[PDB]
Amino acid sequence: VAPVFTVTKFDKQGNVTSFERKKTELYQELGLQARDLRFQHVMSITVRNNRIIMRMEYLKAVITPECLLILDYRNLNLEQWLFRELPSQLSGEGQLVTYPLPFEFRAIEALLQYWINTLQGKLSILQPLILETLDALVDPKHSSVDRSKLHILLQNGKSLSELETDIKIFKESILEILDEEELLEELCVSKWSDPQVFEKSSAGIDHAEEMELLLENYYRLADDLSNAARELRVLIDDSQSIIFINLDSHRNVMMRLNLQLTMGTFSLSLFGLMGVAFGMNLESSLEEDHRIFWLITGIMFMGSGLIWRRLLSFLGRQLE
Amino acid sequence: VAPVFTVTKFDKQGNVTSFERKKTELYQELGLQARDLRFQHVMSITVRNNRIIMRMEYLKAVITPECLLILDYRNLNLEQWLFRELPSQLSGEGQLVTYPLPFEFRAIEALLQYWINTLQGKLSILQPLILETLDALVDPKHSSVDRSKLHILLQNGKSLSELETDIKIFKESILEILDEEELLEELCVSKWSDPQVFEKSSAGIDHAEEMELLLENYYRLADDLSNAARELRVLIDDSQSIIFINLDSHRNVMMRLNLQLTMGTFSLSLFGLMGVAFGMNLESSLEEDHRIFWLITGIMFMGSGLIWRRLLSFLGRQLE
Amino acid sequence: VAPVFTVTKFDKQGNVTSFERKKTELYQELGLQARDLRFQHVMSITVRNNRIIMRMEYLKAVITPECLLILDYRNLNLEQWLFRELPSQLSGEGQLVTYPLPFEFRAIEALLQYWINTLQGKLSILQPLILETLDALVDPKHSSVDRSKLHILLQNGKSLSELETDIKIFKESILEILDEEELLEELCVSKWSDPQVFEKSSAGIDHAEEMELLLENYYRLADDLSNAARELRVLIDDSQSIIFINLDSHRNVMMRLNLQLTMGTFSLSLFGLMGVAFGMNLESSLEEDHRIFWLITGIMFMGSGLIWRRLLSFLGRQLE
Amino acid sequence: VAPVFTVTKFDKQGNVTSFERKKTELYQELGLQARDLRFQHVMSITVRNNRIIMRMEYLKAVITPECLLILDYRNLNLEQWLFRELPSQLSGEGQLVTYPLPFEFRAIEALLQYWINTLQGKLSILQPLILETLDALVDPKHSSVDRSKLHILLQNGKSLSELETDIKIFKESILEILDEEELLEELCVSKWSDPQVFEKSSAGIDHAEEMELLLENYYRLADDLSNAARELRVLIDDSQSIIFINLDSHRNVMMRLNLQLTMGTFSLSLFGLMGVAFGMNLESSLEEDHRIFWLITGIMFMGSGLIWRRLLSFLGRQLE
Amino acid sequence: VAPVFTVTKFDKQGNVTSFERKKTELYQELGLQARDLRFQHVMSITVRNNRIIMRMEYLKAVITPECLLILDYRNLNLEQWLFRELPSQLSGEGQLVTYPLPFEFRAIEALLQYWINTLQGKLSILQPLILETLDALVDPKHSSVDRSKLHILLQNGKSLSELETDIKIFKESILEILDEEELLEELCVSKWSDPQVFEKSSAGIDHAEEMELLLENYYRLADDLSNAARELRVLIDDSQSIIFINLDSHRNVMMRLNLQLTMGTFSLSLFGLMGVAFGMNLESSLEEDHRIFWLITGIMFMGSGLIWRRLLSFLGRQLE
Ligand SMILES: [Cl-]
Asked: What are the subcellular locations of this protein (chains A, B, C, D, E)?
């Protein structure tokens, strides 16, 4: 019932072996204490007892001068990436540019490349959806917006905020290592494993310089990603403001038209009150007149028109 | 009538003893002046006369190379935590990973763990309530929102702001110690209590390194908590914007429908004015006609329909 | 007609003497140039020619190793504070914890304590007013808010912004001194006045350490005050957002009810148009029928009900 | 056709001479290359070949150990300031406090004083206008705001933003010089012009100290100005929020009153439909009844009142 | 099928030659590895193996002590700039002020000048469009805004945000080089290509000083551009707020007028209900009266006027 790790091991030749190992046995083999392998912090890079420990969300890796270990990889869809790219990248002529360099350089480059590719894929998925939703929402010919698109935009905005947080954490973790030279020196595990051998093995090539160059490359890539995400957020905010203004303008137009119709209706009712009063069954001295009916009707209609025009002019003066 | 402290003392063996002591007697025993134990600042960590003084809101602790003291603990529901975890953690094989290290390491680790657990519990309580309230509020099928949920959201937002302030203060206090090596050296109270003994007692193990590792661990945990809180705040703001847009859209739809009905009513009244005028009790030359009544009624109805259709077309053209 | 200062002098024994002195005479006595005592900057702390010059808004003080001077104190309600606390604090067993330390320590502590008490009093006055105003304004059962409370809230917000600016300036002034050790060394005026005497007078006590401790204490107090003010501002903003949402929801509810009533009125007018048409004084072939009147009335009422129900169903479908 | 400068020269005696000089001749006389005198950057202070070059928007100055030059001064209303203050300030007992110091101190002090006075005048002009406009706009007894005041407020806000940018640039330029001691040493042009002479001429007075004091003074003044501008901006934002809330409340009140009147009108029309139906010219069996007319009228009126009261109660229950 | 570069080469004499070269051949000739010429990062300036590599969006350049290379220039409208300015600038008396300096100074100055001119042109294009659109939108005499101008403003705001991001990146890239002296020393490729020759060739002129001056110039220009862009953004936000307030005020005015007309209509209908009731065909005891008709009509009209005036007074009291 002892806790165990599902370990995938890649040697210097690219060979891959998957098995399970007890936690205590792994601690004894790697020469590390338990507190080293807690993996409590997301996106942490550390060097303990000449071994590199890396965590990136769901990816947990341990780098040694002899081999690389991936821990707790199941149910993450990582099998395709592992078994189709890592043997080629570590022990081949793939996209890695650190082949003459020791193994740890290739391992770190592969891990950083995988994470940066994941982030780039997330952003490339997010961008078109947000762009098309914003384009649909800011259509000026729509009286009211579609609420399903609003919900979709809210979900995409939450996803974008999470992605931006991930990018910021990735940048900070790299920059912290880059700032201090001691960490860069510690990262060269092969050099410090056998210092006597590498004192003469290194043919004038500076391992710290190579590590700094690689980390600077990946930091710049992450910075570009962060800039793109920030621009997307700003665009979302501007589109929201434009939507608000459009809705207000539509409301104003509808209100003005309704007001004009109300003025017309009020004038019509006011001048029909005369006919209503004449319609009651009471005695009067105007029944005998012949032209009185047409005269009253004409006065009613002409006065309705004149008062409506006067009211419209008053409204125009008020609204300037 | 002299002021006193309610002191809970844990020795190196985990034994717990609770009593009361006069302030002057405590000052004399600990070798500290009164100004040292004012506890004026919330979340302060200091080292005075080779003794550590810590305050975290309602928790006041003094760490010595021989024992630990908790001050003013009553009416805080801390008795359960104290008497059920501290004897086990300090003098056992619990979650602490600093058992071979001196006592102050275990004490600091226990206090930091308790505070970080409190913060994590607060956040884990807050998150589902805010999430479900936001999900209920952004329902697009609701014409108007529920105000009780609004009040609940306001209270939860205030609580979240307070929690974020607490996390920021906790991060700053730790980072200030971590920046300077002198404070880290001072924190090793056991080493400086008997420097001659620990000059040879330390079997190549660096106490400052262990202190730095522990503080870095807790700082990273606090940073993760702060990131989660910030993401929650951003989500709240986005949900508020979505709610505003939804309310505006509903208002626009209702206004448009009301306008259309107003146009219909105005047309009906305008064409009924003809019947009202014909209804007055005045003489006319059109009474003898037979088909005039049906002709007038048909003209009224057909014209009402035509003018309503024309007005609707005008509205559609205006709103595009 | 020469410009003069109203000077209040406190000696090392706490005795207080108030008088007036010409500016040139004061410059000659204190050994300072005119440009030193311009007091142009609010909240400035400086050391010139072994004399400390301090300004905090309306408070102007000069600290010397022998005595303290307060300048331009009239018409500021400071007489009570001066004559009731300063003689006790400077030459007594009051709240000051720097009695064995030289005079300048007591003077600086008293001035900083007075300013921090003023800021705390301002915040403690401001907080309940804003809290109760916000509680009154966010009442969900009010159709519209009270504008007098809005004006009160605006005034209180302006006051809070001014207080926050004052706290920020106070923090910055202290932190600038705390950052550099040269300023801390200069602040010990008694030590540098007679360096030969204090070379042996100091019995192993570090004046710079005491000054650093005092300044750190007051900086922490100011930081706590700033945190409280920022939390209050955030609460105000959240309450404003909640008020906006409540007003929008009330408007939507009223608009929906008005729309339903408009639909009912339109249906009633449409079906009463039939009676209006039948009411005109024109010949027809339906007068002889007996049950035609009740039949028309029943059709009118039943159709009004049916069309109103259909319109309400249409509105419900539109609003989902 | 060679480009020329309109040069105003002030000697150490305050004498002023205005003329024009070719650019190449000026370069040869001042011992500077062309690229030095491009004046491309607004608010730049530099030292080249032991000569100080300063630009502040429209003011271009060159300071030498022997004299000061102002370049391109025409059509700027600077003639009054130049010919009425500079001869007095440079060679008199005016507001300058650096008379015993060399000429460059007086020149720099005069230029900085002029610029800070310009900024203070701009702020003192801006503040009352914005304050009175905001006071007029936030009047709670106004149903709608005045749009001309809105335009005035917009113009004043743009001016305030420009002024704040100018203050920030002025602060940054001074702080950059203050941070590095090399620039402060370079600024003492008189000392470096004849180092052998000033090696013994300086009677224990530190020129760098005086320069630091002067620059710190002007930096503090600029900081105070920036704080005032920021407070004004915050006040403007708060006033805008209050205006929004007031407008929303007025709209809600008007909408509620309109709704109540609509309910009354609908009830009246509904109960008048009965009279309209009775008014048609159709046969019925209720004509012979005497009290039927008064009975119908009384039922109509009483029912109108009762249904209006019921509807108002329903509205009150809905709005709570 | 090997990948190739379209290379434009400028020698020290300004002669230009365009051709194509395989990537491997270019790597071998320039003495650089493949990873050096990936050009993955936008706006990157680096020095590798005594060769400068620069990328600015679509511009890719390699600077050597002997010649300059532009890579992948087709389909970018850069042919005009290249063939009409670069031969003159590099080998002539043009705007460059670094003619006596080595070739790399002229090359870097030309590239930086081109980029800063591009940014200035973009801003000068953007500013008038945004200014005129904002002026048109904030017209207080317009009841509703024009939505096409809103779309134009949204597009221009997106363009401005992109431009501001570009300016920020350009500033950061320059400042990073300016901060460290090692990079400035590395930038002097001619000095390090033949250190023995330039140890005596340099006649007391400091190449690092010249590089620092040039980079500081361009950094200041970029800072001015960034300030202008930020001011434009602030102006846009203020204009949006003013537009919101104007729309709200117009809505309030229209609503008030509609409410007054509704009150009048309700009064008219209420007092016409009397005539409607009198109009029904039912027996009554008031037919014989003569003056009853005129009396009822006069009471109806006078009461309508009085109740309308009372209602208007009530509305005025409610709105204060
Ligand atoms: Cl509205």
From this structure: Mitochondrion inner membrane
